Design a protein around this ligand. Structure first.
Ligand code: ZN
Lengths: 136, 25, 213, 67, 101
RNA sequence: GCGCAAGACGGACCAGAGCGAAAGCAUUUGCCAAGAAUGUUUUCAUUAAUCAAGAACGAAAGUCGGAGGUUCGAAGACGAUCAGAUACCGUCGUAGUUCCGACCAUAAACGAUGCCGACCGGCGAUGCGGCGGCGUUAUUCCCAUGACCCGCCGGGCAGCUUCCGGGAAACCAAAGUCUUUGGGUUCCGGGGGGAGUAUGGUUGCAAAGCUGAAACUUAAAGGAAUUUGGCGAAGGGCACCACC
RNA sequence: CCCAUGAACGAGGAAUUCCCAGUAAGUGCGGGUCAUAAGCUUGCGUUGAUUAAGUCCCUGCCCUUUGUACACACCGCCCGU
RNA sequence: AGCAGAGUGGCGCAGCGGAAGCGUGCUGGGCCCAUAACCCAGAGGUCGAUGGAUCGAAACCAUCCUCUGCUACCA
């Protein structure tokens, strides 16, 4: 918890993978390589209602919790790596990333380079469902 | 009914007629 | 229940000698205990860094991959592993009413670095062009692909690793292509998009000494 | 929770159209007093005026639509 | 009767095009029949731009965009109100709706 | 986050664009074979058009014998929804989906519009081949070539307007040149049901394919377009016999 | 009219009515029926508020476009064991 | 003939000290133009019986009765 780094002159970088879908949000922060984690909280950690766990407020609360964890641990700067569901399902990010980014910026956590890293397919396998789709 | 499923039940009637024709020999 | 993060020691990683900024960042690892050593745990690790935060105030949409091999004690040295382009710029190149030509060559340097390069070029709409088409025939596409093949093959086998990397810091291969290939069809958006490592030779420490000073 | 958010009070600048299923809510454009440069949109219940200052329990959310 | 001069699509001398899938649905739709939406939008629209720019390490930073292509079936396009029905004389208009903002 | 293994598919580029008799065809390179259009002061000289018998190709699904089975997923096992739900929804999952080899010959196989030939308004673009012409680029001179601009010629997919003309109208530059009725030629329909049904023949391992009635019953069944009402259709306004 | 008799009823389930200014509500007085005559109705006066200046979510209405196998007009028409 | 289970609203069932409920059936009302679904309310109870402990038992104590699980006419 104690380290010989310079606070005023420079800063410490990590990366944070924000995976947001239409069912859940994932605010995961690691080191610069991504091999070694820092803290991982999700939209199920803050709200116990299973209706809206991909809600913006749950993602906001999880982002404030992981920002407090990185502040008490000693991480000052973050590189945002945004992610959707990917694959053959969808490409639009979920309704938690917009609140999660603003909650990460509002807490005093400095933001470096932001990027969308989602799995894009070059015509992968068949999507779940019939030929006529899911009729509702 | 539409023509598709009326056609299908006609084919099933044809099938049953064919088996009773072959087993009624 | 005890906190596992009290047994973490911060490290430092250093870029190779072709980069002006030497310090890349800090990483942490569990404290060593018995059989598993912390030097082995930093053996396979890849960092995804950008060019504008590594060389100087250059373009900011080119990313490099760097892998460590050895640790000198709170100090790690890395070597080049691959090059890839930032997604938003790359999908901003692709638009409708134009054609794009791809190529791929397995070529290797003077040492045992077997590479795999990918180049993409986009057709230029002329300044006084009224036609919205800006299309090209298939044999022109084949000739442009052959010419880009010869250009990105020729500038590799006579060069070592350092000169190839210093060539990759600007888009000099792309400028040489769009100067060479504009006799057939003019191009406006030409860069090399991906460089891969397939085979790696034996690790001896002289290269890792002279590639960091 | 385990965190006491300090209460901030904000004054409106312009009233928008009335949102909600029955039209009982109203979109307003509030602005903060500790730094008079920030403008966000909040959902209010009840009649509001121009220059009417409102209390805010939280200052982090944004206004959603009628749904 | 014949509703349109074409068949609501762009197939004239082909007879077969490659089918694609919907985004809202999973319905197999031909490529020239589906409604296309090449949308351009930012990560942060108009409220978090000042919060990102005031908490950024770098000065004079451009904000990246989202470039995705949406493929819609006809029922999913009407139900999401992407396109709406028109009059018989106004059906023949082929220009896109004008943009202002 | 680092690699390994298997199988499927070729996004954005991708358009009322191209090729093919149709079904159909989208990573790179190499080999073989075929073809339309353009160009020609080249060659044979009527060798042509449509076609009973006969013959090739023919989506998906289905069948037989192998390999392989990643994803999806008829039947099936469940969880909810519901008065009921063996349905819409969700988790698994069998044949099949993939390739080889042998079968059947079926689609809204549609442009719901057979093939050849002639004539009959324009307009601006598109793909190919050819021709002419101010100019710019491949770094400043010349020539030809590729890349743009201005116009034409022939063929092809198309688009806009039209009291040419036609039709029941929707609409059509062909669905026109038709009572002022004849250019040549093949297939095919005489009110709606029974019915693509019974039987006979024939093909096939099977599923089934082709040919194909009658008895009886019926005064309507249909096509286009207009005016009302009704939409768990859309877009604007209103009401305390509506709500907040 | 007089004296006795002093029951249910402890703020009411599902649902539903009326109204926004001298208004709702409380409170009494006239007229109609009337030989005997108001718990109803029509008028009148006194006291006198809460909330809101909006919406199309419910129940419906007006206009335009579109769809229809409906026209005794969706409370319509229609398929099968 | 010998040991155990059950005895509770028309029917089946939960219960063991401070204390009559459930699913179902019946009747009535609302919702709708009306019916069916849906909602609400109620009637319907010697808790099989006897005497006792306990301030107080449907339950605790001893007995009998009714229907079942096992031995079976055991001289
Ligand atoms: Zn869909």
């Amino acid at each position: 918890s104690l380290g010989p780094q310079v606070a005023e002159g420079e800063n410490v970088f990590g990366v944070c993978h924000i995976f947001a879908s239409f069912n859940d949000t994932f605010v995961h922060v690691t080191d610069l390589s991504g091999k070694e984690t820092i803290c991982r909280v999700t939209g199920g950690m803050k709200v116990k209602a299973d209706r809206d766990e991909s809600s913006p407020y749950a993602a906001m609360l999880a982002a404030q919790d992981v920002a407090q964890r990185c502040k008490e641990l000693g991480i000052t700067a973050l590189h945002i790596k945004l992610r959707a569901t990917g694959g053959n399902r969808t490409k639009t990010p979920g309704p938690g990333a917009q609140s999660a980014l603003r909650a990460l910026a509002r807490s005093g956590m400095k933001i470096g380079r932001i990027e969308d890293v989602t799995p894009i397919p070059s015509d992968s396998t068949r999507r779940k469902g019939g030929r006529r789709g899911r009729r509702l | 009914m539409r023509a598709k499923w009326r056609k299908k039940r006609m084919r099933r009637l044809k099938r049953k007629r064919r088996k009773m024709r072959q087993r009624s020999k | 229940v005890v906190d596992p993060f009290s047994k973490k020691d911060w490290y430092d990683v250093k870029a190779p000698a072709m980069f002006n900024i030497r310090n890349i960042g800090k990483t942490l690892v569990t404290r060593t205990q018995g059989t598993k050593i912390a030097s082995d745990g930093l053996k396979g690790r890849v960092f995804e860094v950008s060019l504008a935060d590594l060389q100087n105030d250059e373009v900011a949409f080119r990313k490099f991959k760097l892998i460590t091999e050895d640790v000198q004690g709170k100090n790690c040295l890395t070597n080049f592993h691959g090059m890839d382009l930032t997604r938003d710029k790359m999908c901003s190149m692709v638009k409708k009413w134009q054609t794009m030509i791809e190529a791929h060559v397995d070529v290797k340097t003077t040492d045992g670095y077997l590479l795999r390069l990918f180049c993409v070029g986009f057709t230029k709409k002329r300044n006084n062009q009224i036609r919205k088409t800006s299309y090209a025939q298939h044999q022109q596409v084949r000739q442009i692909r052959k010419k880009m093949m010869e250009i990105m093959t020729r500038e590799v086998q006579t060069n070592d690793l350092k000169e190839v990397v210093n060539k990759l810091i600007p888009d000099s291969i792309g400028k040489d292509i769009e100067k060479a290939c504009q006799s057939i069809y003019p191009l406006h958006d030409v860069f090399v998009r991906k460089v891969k490592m397939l085979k790696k030779p034996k690790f001896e420490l002289g290269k890792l000494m002279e590639l960091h000073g | 929770t385990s965190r006491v958010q300090p209460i901030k009070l904000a004054r409106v600048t312009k009233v928008l159209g009335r949102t909600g299923s029955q039209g009982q809510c109203t979109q307003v454009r509030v602005e903060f007093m500790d730094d008079t440069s920030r403008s966000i949109i909040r959902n209010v219940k009840g009649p509001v005026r121009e220059g009417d200052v409102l209390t805010l329990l939280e200052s982090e959310r944004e206004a959603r639509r009628l749904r | 009767t014949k509703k349109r001069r074409n068949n609501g699509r762009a197939k004239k001398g082909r007879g077969h095009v490659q089918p694609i899938r919907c985004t809202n649905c999973a319905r197999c739709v031909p490529k020239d029949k589906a409604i296309k939406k090449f949308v351009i939008r930012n990560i942060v629209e108009a409220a978090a731009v000042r919060d990102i720019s005031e908490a950024s390490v770098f000065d004079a930073y451009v904000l990246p965009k989202l470039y995705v292509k949406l493929h819609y079936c006809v029922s999913c396009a009407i139900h999401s109100k992407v396109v709406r029905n028109r009059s018989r004389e106004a059906r023949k208009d082929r220009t896109p709706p004008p943009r202002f903002r």
